[PDB]
């Protein structure tokens, strides 16, 4: 849809703090911080796929809006994830060990803006079309 495409990371703010609040250790944070991923979003019928590709780490999720699914995150959390579309924003929550984090994806001008929240930390990542 508005989201379909191949997107390249162009800016990131507070990602290290976000990962630290998730409990990610130094080595994985190091990898994550200097990753410049592509994000490839596609849709086929009810099923949306989001691939995140980078030199040292790839991930992929496929889901139906509103249907919880199991996910292994890039930092190796085993979470229960649910993604919904609200006012044009793809809102993902991940739940594990009584914690949650939200990842909101929205389209703004030429950007795919990703806002990641864990407790008091807010990270903003901006992707542009490849
Ligand atoms: O899409 C993103 O840019 C993104 C990317 C990553 C990984 C992707 C592979 C390379 C390293 C970074 C990620 O990892 C999960 C955690 F941050 F927790 F490590 N979380 C997100 C985001 F939160 F924003 F969805």
Find the CATH number of the domain harbouring 98.
2.40.128.20
Question: Measured between alpha carbons, how far is 64 from 59 in angstroms, rounded to an integer?
Answer: 17
Q: Which domain holds residue 84?
A: 5-129
Query: Ligand 1, residues 37, 81, 89, 115: which to mutate, most atoms within 8 A of Cβ?
Result: 37
**Residue 125 in marked binding region:** yes
Query: What's the reported resolution, in angstroms, to a tenth?
Result: 1.2
Method: X-ray
Tell the burial category of 92 from Cβ atoms under 10 Å away from its Cβ (0-12, 13-18, 19+): buried
d(CA 44, ligand 1 centre) in Å = 23
Domain count, the chain: 1
Give yes or no for residue 121 CB within 6 A of ligand 1. no
Tell the burial category of 24 from Cβ atoms under 10 Å away from its Cβ (0-12, 13-18, 19+): buried
**Residue 92 · residue 62 · CB < 8 Å:** no
Q: What is the DSSP letter of 74?
A: T
Question: Measured between alpha carbons, how far is 51 from 37 in angstroms, rounded to an integer?
Answer: 10
Residues whose CB is less than 8 angstroms from the CB of residue 125 and which lie 6 or more positions away in sequence, other chains included: 9, 11, 12, 13, 15, 113, 114, 115, 116
- Residue 93 backbone phi and psi in degrees, to 5: -115, 140
Question: Measured between alpha carbons, how far is 48 from 46 in angstroms, rounded to an integer?
Answer: 7
- Residue 20 backbone phi and psi in degrees, to 5: -65, -40
Query: Ligand 1, residues 32, 57, 83, 91: which to mutate, most atoms within 8 A of Cβ?
Result: 32
**Long-range contacts from 19-28, C-beta under 8 angstroms, 24+ separation:** 19/75, 20/121, 21/118, 21/119, 21/120, 21/121, 22/75, 22/77, 22/101, 22/118, 24/75, 28/74, 28/75, 28/76
Give yes or no for residue 38 CB within 6 A of ligand 1. no
């Amino acid at each position: 849809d508005a989201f379909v495409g191949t997107w390249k990371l162009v800016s990131s703010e507070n990602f290290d703090d976000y990962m630290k609040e998730l409990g990610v250790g130094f080595a994985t944070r190091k990898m994550g911080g200097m990753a410049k991923p592509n994000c490839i979003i596609s849709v086929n019928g009810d099923v949306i796929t989001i691939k995140t590709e980078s030199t040292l780490k790839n991930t992929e999720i496929s889901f139906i809006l509103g249907q919880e699914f199991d996910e292994v995150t890039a930092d190796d959390r085993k979470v229960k994830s649910t993604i919904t579309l609200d006012g044009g924003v793809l809102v993902q929550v991940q739940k594990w060990d009584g914690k949650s984090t939200t990842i909101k994806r929205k389209r703004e001008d030429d950007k795919l803006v990703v806002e990641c929240v864990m407790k008091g930390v807010t990270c903003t990542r901006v992707y542009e079309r490849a």
